[PDB]
Amino acid sequence: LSGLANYTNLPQGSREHEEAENRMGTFMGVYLPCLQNIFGVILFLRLTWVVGIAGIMESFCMVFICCSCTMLTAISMSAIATNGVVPAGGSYYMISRSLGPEFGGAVGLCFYLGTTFAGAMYILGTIEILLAYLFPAMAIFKAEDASGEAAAMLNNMRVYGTCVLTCMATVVFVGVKYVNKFALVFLGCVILSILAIYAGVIKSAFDPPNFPICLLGNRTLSRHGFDVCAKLAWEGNETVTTRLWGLFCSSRFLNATCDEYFTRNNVTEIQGIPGAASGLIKENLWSSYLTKGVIVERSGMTSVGLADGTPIDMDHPYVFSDMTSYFTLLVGIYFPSVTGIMAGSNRSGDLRDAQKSIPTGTILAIATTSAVYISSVVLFGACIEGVVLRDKFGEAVNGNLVVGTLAWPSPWVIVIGSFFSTCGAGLQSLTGAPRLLQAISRDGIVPFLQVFGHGKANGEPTWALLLTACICEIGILIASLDEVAPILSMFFLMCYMFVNLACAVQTLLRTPNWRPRFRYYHWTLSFLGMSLCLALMFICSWYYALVAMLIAGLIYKYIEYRGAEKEWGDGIRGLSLSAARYALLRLEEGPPHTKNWRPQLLVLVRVDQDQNVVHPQLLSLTSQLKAGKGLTIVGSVLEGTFLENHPQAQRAEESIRRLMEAEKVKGFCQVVISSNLRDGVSHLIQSGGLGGLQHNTVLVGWPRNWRQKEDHQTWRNFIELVRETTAGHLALLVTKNVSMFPGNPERFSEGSIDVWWIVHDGGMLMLLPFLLRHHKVWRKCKMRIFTVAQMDDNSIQMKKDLTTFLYHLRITAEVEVVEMHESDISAYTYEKTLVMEQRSQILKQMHLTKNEREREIQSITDELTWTKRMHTAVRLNEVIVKKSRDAKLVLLNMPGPPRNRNGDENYMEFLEVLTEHLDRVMLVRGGGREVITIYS
Template sequence: MTEGEAKPQVEIVVVGATDSAHASPKSDDIPVVSTEVFADKAKQKQLKFTIDPAINEGSESGSSSVRELPIADLEKEPQFDHYRNALSIKRQIIPRRPSLKQLHGVEWDQDQESIPLPSQKVPIEAEKKKLGWIEGVLIRCVLNIIGVMLYLRISWVAAQAGLLLGSVVLLLSSAIVFLTALSMSAICTNGKIRGGGTYFIISRSLGPDFGGSIGIIFAVANAVSAAVYLAGFADTVLEVMKNHNAYIVDGGVNDIRIIGWITAVLLLAVVCAGLNFESKAQIVLLIVLIVSLLNYFAGLCMSPTTLQRAQGITGFNGTTLTDNSLPDWRGETFASVLAVYFPAATGFLAGANISGDLKEPEKAIPKGTIIGVTITSILYLAVLWLTGATCVRDASGLVEDLNNGMLSACAINQTCNYGLHNYYHILEIEGAWGPLITAGVFSSTLSSALASTVSAPKVLQAVARDRIFPYIGFFAKGSKKSDEPVRGYLLTFAITVGIIAIGDINQIAPLISNFFMASYALINYACFDASFAKSPGFRPAFKFYNMWLSLLGAFTCTVMMFFISWVNALITVIFIMLLYVYLTRRKPDVNWGDSTQANSFKNAVQNMLKLQTTQDHVKTYRPMILLLTGNPCKRKQMVNFVSNITRNQGMLICGQVLLAPLDDSTLQARQHFSQKIVWWLKKRHIRAFYYSYLANNLQEGVLALLQLCGMGKLSPNIMIMGFKNDWDTSDYAVIKEYFLLIHCGFDFNKGVGILRIPNSAKAPAEKETKAFMEIFNSERQQPNLLRTSADDRLDGRSSICTSQSVESFAVFAERLMPTDSERKRAKSTTERNNVFSVRTGQVVKRDIQDEKNKANADPRCHTASSSSSLSEASARSQFEIEVLDNEEKKKHAILSITKLRRKASMEKTSKVAVENFQKRIKKAVIDVWWLYDDGGLSILIPHLLSQEGYLENAKLRVFTIVKRSDVFDDEQSKLIILLNKLRIKFNKVNVYAEDRIQDNEETLRLFHELISKFKVPNKTVGQMEEPAASVLVDDVELATFRSTTERIMKARNLLLTHSKNANLIIVTIPVPRKKALSASLYLAWLELLSRDLPLTFLLRGNQEPVLTFYS
């Protein structure tokens, strides 16, 4: 190639990465992607660029070779199947997009590229033939809307309301139907529609409560409608037979029953033959209907015969048109005429009801329904005006009266037999050949009955498959070949036969019309609600709708229900509400992303924003509690007690700090565990949130929880933790850490509560918790995820687990069985760190236990770092998975479940319920020791507990201690007045003077016993390093806080004397002075106020008022 010659350019077309395997390109190859393209190249977005071949000179392949462009190894381009619901596709391999963890650095697992399912047969949905929008929707809509009303009642509407008001009746009905069709079209185009029709649309939009209610009603309404249509068909056949002097039995109701039953059997055979055969039958009926209507229009073009003129047929006549323009009410009103006509317009959902059998329901339903409604509305309006322009209102039918000009004279004494007012078969008289009109009547009734016979089982099958109602799962199964609801067909047949057997169904038909109207009202409301919620997930492809028009449609449908028959409307509403209440209480375990969820989110955000700009007021104060529970399942008593405070009156957040490194296994375990805790809280009917935080140490985690949990004004204002029973024997680092948590609460301006549950209440709760956890893990046959929670140390029932004695436990984790690599990794990690030993579900911390044994000689020699946090290896091993593969262990687990269930049942006594703070205690007593003015929290909490919960209607006894006896009487009267003004109901007020309370040698000895372990010589504390400097106490500090110590000891003497038998003791505690008060002295105070006493709640407000006596 010469220097001046233009270099050839290679055009590259990037069409996206493919899934096919290719060899890795060499470094000097031209980076070109695979030539695989989509079938429809016109739909591809192509990115063209050129590459100079000189770049590749010298390459083996040459400059024109084509190679694969390595766009990404793991990244996938947008694919249709990635957005498919894998659970809805049967027997297919569904490609799956790579997870964030895989893209973020975890090894690529080829097994995760797709969801392997048993076989690759074509799914049932693809095996059976689907219907297009004409055959599946348009024809069914037209056939179901065009019924006997067109043939037998449209002329009556013209006679009563006149052409003008009659047109208003028709247009008003069509407008309501058209609005509903628009709403339905919007919902149908907001995602893929499956089987179930109206039920599917409403349930996925408004949720299972409304959807399930209307699903059952709609299925019943369709089944009964089939009987109504068949009864109408049988009545018409019987009229024809009577005209020919023929009958079967008696020419009455028995003949109607026989004809109806025979027809029902024939329709059952048609639908059981398959939907394709039924569709062909519908086409035949449509042809008959079209021929019948063409016969009518042809008859209008003919000149009327003498007999027809005697029967009131005038042909197109301006005088007739003028006379029939205005209304001529004869025992009817506009409302009654509208009530008679409106049910004729309610068959437009026939196509939507077989949504599962349509090729593209999201396209077919809107197109077919709207076109069908438009065609039938025009047809009804045309027939109304044609009959009004060609037939008089009254005619005797006698040729002599016609010749004498007295044709309508019979109207005076109401003896006319013909005319729009008196004869319903006007279309038959005006048609070119009367029998064809009768055939049209047969066709319309049979097509409507056939559509109802198909719709009812389809809807019932969809409801049964969603499992929101019990005992109907039998009807969920379809036929093997085409998934037809044969069982539903048989049930519909039985209902139809039973209704026909009643004979007189005139009273049932209006109720069924109201059932349909309720469905249409909910469709409109579903569209409005989804639009009004402004959910990003509501993105209908159909744009010709408006949420306010949908709301108008819902309102008009509801009005029409009561307009037609308020009694039937009331029955319909009551029936729906009963089903709704049942489903609400049953709480079906489904999640369809309905508008109810969207509205909940929207309302929550709006209210949160409103609260954020609302200034706090003492009258609106509510306790919002951060409860440091660790694993809430292991602190059930603690959670139950605090939930009694916040029940319907505040907010409870269960907080847990997890000591673990930030890695993928930890995050996954945390996520699964959080889901299980939420489930556990829900099952126990505890209204609480759950927050967990990964941290290096306990204090860091609690600080994060205090700052981050909650949102806006819905953030905790009280922090509650468990009392550390073994503080006096713990390491200095652990004592300091616990003491600092109390300071953290006050630092963030929170009220602080410390709950001490006496030892007598521990055992039953421990047994129940252990049984619950073992059953939970064993029944699901899932591996236990073993880990340690840092704030298991904050136990309200037992001693706090330090890093020397870590209380490990099995965490619920909903997890698939691990792969071989996970098994090996778990095993090697366990062996390497020598951490866990699994024996009958218990986890023992070997290395930490060894350290504890070594430290017996000097239990306070550990440093802060070694005692307050775990090593990275130990923390990581807490989250490793131990898989129990041994079959014997599985059998043992099953036997253990049975034993545990029996044991749990035997231990479920009233005593356990009381100790778990669930069962109400009769004649309960709450003693409040209001030692310090903390803003009123110490008196508000017992008041809330006495309002509801296990201490409902408890007696409230208030105690306080004043400094001098000379103000004793005055302070007592003031306290009584204050409580009355605060509207706190109390049983007794006791005020004690501090200088009159006698000392107790036992209390003094206990204090010295507690403090002697931590007492050091003066001027040595300041020279010590942490954590000892924050824990130890000297004589100077004891002298500084001597008055407080004496007050605490005297309070203990009174507590032992007066509150030994109380069901709950609430004591106001002093605020610890930062940099002045040691941890050991403060914890000694708390020990004095709670040891050897019933359930004790040590509490201190943040000094902000929570009570006021002003209105």
């Protein structure tokens, strides 16, 4: 078709990434390289053995929790694909560009260790097929002709595993273009072998395949060694013994001295593969765990037993178990039969729509190998009987591969068909592993690896091959599948767990550039799949899971330390520099800030001619209001230029540092040399903070001695600060008589705290006495609430809503409604009428109706010129001082500033007549955009 001349199941790596600085639909580029790294030697060498030991409903469940593991990791990888633009280079560049260089050096290094131990599991599966089924005469170590054949079997896999690994790691050094060419014969040998196996089980429902086994009375024998079973060889006229007699008795002379189990029992011959038609699921759907050295023993037979001490004599031709078996041992052997799901992203800079091919091409290439493994375990447990399943190496059927004796041609279709694919999977993983190590050490995220990025011309790793040919050597010296198999399955389960974790902590915390766009992500499938990866990590080996999880987390913190040492300059200083910046960039997203207002505060203090703070008691009121929580920035302004008044600001800086550590204030300090104090104050209200760590209110003193002279632009700077916060939508706390405010160890014995509503923000006016009584100074004071009502309304019902609001919150205050009818209150009500419904649009976008419009007053209660007739607060101040003149703290809402600046001094002498004969006052001012629904 001339498009299949570019098949290439190999991964891209580093060379196709650097050349993208300056064709493959779904089937040929994603789906087929994924259905070629998934199918492997466990399907042809171990899946019959685990269904004979676990049975169905224990193999059926371990193929259902090992496949539902990798299905949920496949969803999390499809979110990484549909995030950015899918860079060219493979799976290392596609993950570490959407999860950061820390979650990419840890997934990227647990993956190189997984495939370099998979590459030892394929060379181990090569010599198993070459020594047990192809050529069992090349075996160079024959131990003693005794029961000590286990050690010579291991020492034969160590001299041939080394000789194959040397020749395999020198084919991919000179013949890389040839191994790329031969990638289509490997996919054919896999796909032909699976079609052969499903072929013969449809033939078996009509014609069974005729493989016979021989039982010495409920004991399975090894057919290698004798010809005909029969025990007698009747032969016609005279009878002479068989060769089966010659292995159990003293000689072939027919006289005497045979052994005891041989003499009291007969022999039998049954069909080892009794077709799919025989009702063999029933007597094969339960477990049969065995111990090392146990005869396999077909159940349901006669077997007169010796009932003696059983000197079983491990030299007779029996079939013994070679290892003890249980459920959690089988999961670590079966698990590498589902790995290979990062192969759908091998060719990511070759597709035409890589955000559509990588999702559907790996979800379908997983759901179709699940339909093979689930249907193989039912059909193997309905066509073969148990004692032929329960031995590997096929001793009951004369040295034939047990899955091979089910194919439509002779069993050499599967024996050669598995020999080449296990050779072409260890040639693949010995190229894809030293490519990924070369891709890691070019990025420089791990600085000691940096000589494993060197190559020859045209890429093609030269030193990373030498390291991979030594790590794969120590899986050859172990020399056993069922030992190398659960080791690599821990490394693959580790990297599938860090992928699932990183994609779930970023959707919750809302990291900035992360959009999955997939369709079915929902953040919990990546969390539920993480909960299955470490569950399966524990039941393979908890002493393996606990050490592969610790050094993965100990290279995560080596990326962050070395990455911050070059980003900011020094190491341990940079970890906190990087943690603050990343938390700030997370804040700027776009959704609104908060639906429960909390004063952040920005304290404006004044210093004097030798730079000491003028009123230090303003800083102790912040300590009694914040109690260490939130943000607090203190700011002072000097006059002059920076160029010659800067040492006057070095020591004005440290005098607020030394004083906010003595009044126990937790926050930051900013000292600014402006040319005048009018705009230098106005700057700090604008640029206070960094990003989302910005202030919310201003706390400033009162401009006392304003009326005299010689401070003429001090009270004109005050009224311009009231207008700058109404336009900037901040809030305002101004404290009159700052020197009368208590220090930290003074502790008012009793008394009260009065609040006056009038007709404005109560959520801001009930929260401030609430927060004050969490301090040891204001703990013992009561709290009385005075609200001013007009008339023509009711008030009688207004106080009822006030009482249940305190009942629903347990504040234990008391209310009293004072009433005006004439123009006593007009600086509050007259100038604005629409704020009642202007407040409503602030709470309509708030989107809370179910029991959240309760626990929030103001709304539950809502039920003649400044210039020289004007506003008069004498009738208002006379009713305030009649009931609050000795109350330790009064809280008032101050009225809104006038429009035209011709009434800027009629406004200041409204605030003096309002608050006369009152000792400690604190005037508040709203901003409209404050709701408080939960009172801490």
